[PDB]
Design an enzyme around this catalytic site. Structure first.
Site, PDB file in Angstrom:
ATOM      1  N   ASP A   1       0.816  -1.199   0.000  1.00  0.00           N
ATOM      2  CA  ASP A   1       0.000   0.000   0.000  1.00  0.00           C
ATOM      3  C   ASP A   1       0.857   1.259   0.000  1.00  0.00           C
ATOM      4  O   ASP A   1       1.351   1.669   1.048  1.00  0.00           O
ATOM      5  CB  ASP A   1      -0.923  -0.018   1.222  1.00  0.00           C
ATOM      6  CG  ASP A   1      -1.853   1.178   1.295  1.00  0.00           C
ATOM      7  OD1 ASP A   1      -1.928   1.978   0.337  1.00  0.00           O
ATOM      8  OD2 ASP A   1      -2.557   1.291   2.327  1.00  0.00           O
TER       9      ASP A   1
ATOM     10  N   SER B   1      -0.356  15.756 -11.988  1.00  0.00           N
ATOM     11  CA  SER B   1      -0.594  15.394 -13.380  1.00  0.00           C
ATOM     12  C   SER B   1      -0.807  16.656 -14.212  1.00  0.00           C
ATOM     13  O   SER B   1      -1.326  17.661 -13.711  1.00  0.00           O
ATOM     14  CB  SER B   1      -1.801  14.456 -13.496  1.00  0.00           C
ATOM     15  OG  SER B   1      -2.187  14.262 -14.854  1.00  0.00           O
TER      16      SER B   1
END
Length: 323
Positions: free
Chosen positions: A35, A192
């Site tokens: 994770d 992004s």
């Protein structure tokens, strides 16, 4: 040193991935959820309330000659005490790793028999051990790794690979584009450069988010998610289901996200998470709004479309390649 381990979807929807991990001496092998959005290594154990164990493989520190109780240390996320022990992933060994033993576990974990625990790969600043905070497996391994990196190569309805300490140049196409990381929230947080829906034009816009292998779906701002689902006939947000659903008869468009000047394309099929209930003709969407979360999350839906490098150098970065 290096390590390399296969990670396997727990079900037919890629809801999560499990990776075998060896703990203790002799080895006890547990299947853990790697994770990158958390920083604790915790396991079902011989100390977990028996009623709350339902099929999981448990860690028994009393059967391990290298297990030592970390006196006074507790954790809470699901809670318990802490041992140190030897932990190996894919041939890579860490001694004195904090292994957090569950006394109590959430019903959500009890119900999912395939996940024996979590192996956190976010920054150690998010580790919950008190009063002495503990290092992640990756942080402990860094000293011995050939290069202070690990890579996530998740499969679509198929096994993939976690590598530690090296970059497998046969595992991706083209070049790896590296992008800046902020560690200020303890996550692999990056920005992004934009998105496109299907064959549509690319929209240049900054989207701050985290690379989180522990999250199944892709969670993006409501504007972006609305633009995506507007291209699917019959798609709608359902309060009863808790997100966007679409007719199971639909063909989903791809979704492209930007990494610097590069582009990662998520095929439409990756965004299909199947009927909301058995026999239903309504299907659950793999791109959902982050509006009620507080952060955008590049979860498995996005990450499995790429070869992803988690560069844990002093200035950390993230790399993405097509594959």
């Amino acid at each position: 040193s290096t390590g390399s381990a296969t990670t396997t979807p727990i079900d037919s929807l890629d809801d999560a991935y499990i990776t075998p991990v060896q703990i203790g001496t002799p080895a006890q092998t547990l299947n853990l959820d790697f994770d990158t959005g958390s920083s604790d290594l915790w396991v079902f154990s011989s100390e977990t309330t028996a009623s709350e164990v339902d099929g999981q493989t448990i860690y028994t520190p009393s059967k391990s000659t290298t297990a030592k109780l970390l006196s006074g240390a507790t954790w809470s996320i699901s809670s318990g005490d802490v041992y140190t022990d030897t932990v190996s992933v894919g041939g890579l060994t860490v001694t004195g790793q904090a292994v957090e033993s569950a006394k109590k576990v959430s019903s959500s974990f009890t119900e999912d028999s395939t996940i024996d625990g979590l192996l956190g790969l976010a920054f150690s600043t998010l580790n919950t051990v008190s009063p002495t905070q503990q290092k992640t497996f990756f942080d402990n391994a860094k000293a011995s790794l050939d290069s202070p990196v690990f890579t996530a190569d998740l499969g679509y309805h198929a096994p993939g690979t976690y590598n530690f300490g090296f970059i497998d140049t046969t595992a991706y196409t083209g070049s790896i584009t590296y992008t800046a990381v902020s560690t200020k929230q303890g996550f692999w947080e990056w920005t992004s450069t934009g998105y496109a829906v299907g064959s549509g034009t690319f929209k240049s816009t900054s989207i701050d988010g985290i690379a989180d292998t522990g999250t199944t779906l892709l969670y993006l701002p409501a504007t972006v998610v609305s633009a995506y689902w507007a291209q699917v006939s019959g798609a709608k947000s359902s309060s009863s289901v808790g997100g966007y659903v679409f007719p199971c008869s639909a063909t989903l468009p791809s979704f492209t996200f930007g990494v610097g000047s590069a582009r990662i394309v998520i095929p439409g099929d990756y965004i299909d998470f199947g009927p909301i209930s058995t026999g239903s003709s309504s299907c659950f969407g793999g791109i959902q709004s982050s509006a009620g979360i507080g952060i955008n999350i590049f979860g498995d839906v996005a990450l499995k479309a790429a070869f992803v490098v988690f560069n844990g150098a002093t200035t950390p970065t993230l790399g993405f390649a097509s594959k």
